Amino acid sequence: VDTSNITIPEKLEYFINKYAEHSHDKWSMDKLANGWIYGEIYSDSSKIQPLMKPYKLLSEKEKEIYRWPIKESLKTMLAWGWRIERTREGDSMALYNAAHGYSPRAIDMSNVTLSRDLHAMAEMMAE
Amino acid sequence: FLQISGYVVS
């Protein structure tokens, strides 16, 4: 599906900011089962990385690793003119489910239902 | 993360 250009609205800036805040929880859940944990500095003995900081305190030397492969999906939707509308509610998954008291809040995986627009959007972005 | 986060598309 060829795509030419886009004039996006100013509202579409906080999706990518809120992505990493929720993706770092799954990264912590992935790497906590292994022998990886917060520490002082990167070293093979202590099993420390530079990514292992809070989701807000991500260094400038790596930020695009989280934020790259999301926005190139929205071109195929919004260029043809698909919709990304929103209700007035907003924060919903806060209720419905280590420095700084960190720990993951696992969203459920064994519950999902699909329809025309939903399967369409999922297949469009994964495509 | 997109769908049931206070989001509707129609």
UniProtKB/Swiss-Prot annotation, chain A:
UniProt subcellular location: Sarcoplasmic reticulum membrane
Residues with the Phosphoserine modification: S92
Tissue: Highly expressed in heart, lung, cerebellum and brain. Detected at lower levels in adrenal gland, stomach, thymus, esophagus and ovary.
Entry's free-text remark on domains: The calcium release channel activity resides in the C-terminal region while the remaining part of the protein resides in the cytoplasm.
Protein family membership: Belongs to the ryanodine receptor (TC 1.A.3.1) family. RYR2 subfamily.
Record function comment: Cytosolic calcium-activated calcium channel that mediates the release of Ca(2+) from the sarcoplasmic reticulum into the cytosol and thereby plays a key role in triggering cardiac muscle contraction. Aberrant channel activation can lead to cardiac arrhythmia. In cardiac myocytes, calcium release is triggered by increased Ca(2+) cytosolic levels due to activation of the L-type calcium channel CACNA1C. The calcium channel activity is modulated by formation of heterotetramers with RYR3. Required for cellular calcium ion homeostasis. Required for embryonic heart development.
Name assigned to this protein: Ryanodine receptor 2
Source organism of this protein record: Mus musculus
